[PDB]
Amino acid sequence: RRWWRF
């Protein structure tokens, strides 16, 4: 969500 895959 916040960064990367999330």
DSSP string, 1-6: --STT-
Residue with tokens 């960064």: 3
Q: How was this structure determined?
A: NMR
Greatest pairwise CA separation for the chain in angstroms: 9
Residue with tokens 């969500």: 1
Element (H, E) at 6: none
Residue with tokens 């999330």: 6
Q: In whole angstroms, what is the distance from residue 3 CA to residue 6 CA?
A: 6
Q: Tell me the two tokens of residue 2.
A: 């916040």
